[PDB]
Design a binder for this molecule. Structure first.
Ligand SMILES: O=C(O)c1ccc[n+]([C@@H]2O[C@H](COP(=O)([O-])O)[C@@H](O)[C@H]2O)c1
Length: 331
């Protein structure tokens, strides 16, 4: 099964072949979800094993099978559970292109029911589906995903609240102007406020991050400033260790994507001090991660360097130290 930090690709190959053989059973045996759930858990190599196994899932035709039998009741949750853990970038594209409606609807009905594992699965699927495009975000809003996450914002489960915060951040980033207007109409800040004041640092971080991304839009700045949650940014960045907060979150995974960070870049140039503080904090985190993985040139491909320098120059010392440390971790 799963052991430790070694140089073994034989396990990648073994469990990929197991997965493809089980998937070939087309005309229950959803231990594929257990194997992938524990594959992502591998201490350091979990990213590689997970990506290779999800690619094996798509290539063996299993992704199409999941999207097909997710409108069948007896195989609904059993399949959606596995789909929440294999919504990689390529799989995300495949789903968005050849069956968004079914996946969105199964996530909605997973959140509608009282069983907590189902709600976790549904909120996670929605989170991952909000990381594609303005068009995809608009469509998911139309199909009722935003309503589901804003309803789950009232929950107690921690996994669900984390999925909800990450989903609202992803939507603030990938939505655009129209979708951010829609978010303000749905009173997104109202239900983000209960999350920003959470004790769990992940929920607070990503809720505040969605709020910061939202104040950057100069049309909704006031309504997002009525929340109150940006006044919780300065104590957080000044009391949290950028390297250690990375190790707890988004370090097992190789940080956020270059496109996620590209959406975040324009936050570095906002009117609000707290927005720039939090964006700088996040970039100082991602810079160290990317340096560990040798993908630092990303920050130049997204024209983040100009904004990082402009921020490292500005008077505000909270963001100046973070942006400067980020620039040194790149070159
Ligand atoms: O990136 C990782 O190391 C990782 C760790 C645990 C789970 N995953 C799953 O891999 C998929 C892609 O993750 P992400 O962050 O690119 O949206 C998604 O289904 C995640 O739930 C990914």
């Amino acid at each position: 099964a799963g052991s430790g930090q070694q140089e073994i690709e034989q396990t990648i190959n073994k469990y990929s072949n197991m997965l493809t053989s089980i998937v070939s059973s087309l005309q229950y045996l959803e231990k594929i979800n257990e194997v992938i759930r524990r594959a992502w858990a591998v201490p350091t190599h979990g990213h590689e094993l997970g990506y290779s196994l999800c690619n094996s899932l798509r290539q063996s035709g299993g992704l199409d099978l999941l999207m097909k039998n997710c409108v069948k009741p007896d195989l609904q949750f059993s399949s959606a559970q596995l789909l929440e853990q294999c919504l990689t970038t390529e799989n995300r594209k495949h789903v968005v292109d050849n069956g968004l409606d079914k996946v969105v609807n199964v996530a909605c009905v997973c959140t509608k029911n009282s069983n907590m594992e189902h709600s976790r699965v549904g909120t996670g699927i929605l989170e991952h589906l909000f990381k594609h495009s303005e068009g995809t975000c608009s469509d998911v809003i139309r199909l009722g995903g935003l309503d589901a996450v804003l309803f789950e914002c009232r929950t107690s489960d921690l996994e669900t609240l984390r999925h909800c915060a990450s989903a609202l951040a992803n939507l603030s980033l990938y939505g655009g102007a129209e979708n951010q207007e829609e978010m303000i109409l749905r009173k997104v800040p109202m239900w983000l406020f209960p999350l920003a004041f959470h004790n769990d640092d992940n929920i607070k971080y990503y809720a505040c991050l969605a709020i910061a991304v939202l104040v950057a839009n100069k049309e909704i700045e006031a309504e997002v400033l009525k929340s109150g949650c940006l006044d919780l940014v300065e104590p957080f960045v000044t009391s949290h260790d950028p390297s250690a907060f990375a190790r707890s979150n988004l370090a097992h995974a190789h940080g956020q994507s270059k496109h996620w960070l590209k959406r975040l870049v324009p936050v570095l140039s906002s009117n609000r001090e707290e927005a720039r503080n939090l964006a700088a904090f996040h970039f100082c985190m991602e810079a160290g991660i990317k340096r560990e993985q040798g993908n630092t040139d990303i920050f130049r491909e997204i024209n983040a360097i100009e904004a990082l320098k402009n921020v490292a120059s500005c008077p505000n010392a909270i963001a100046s130290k973070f942006a400067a440390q980020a620039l040194r971790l790149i070159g």
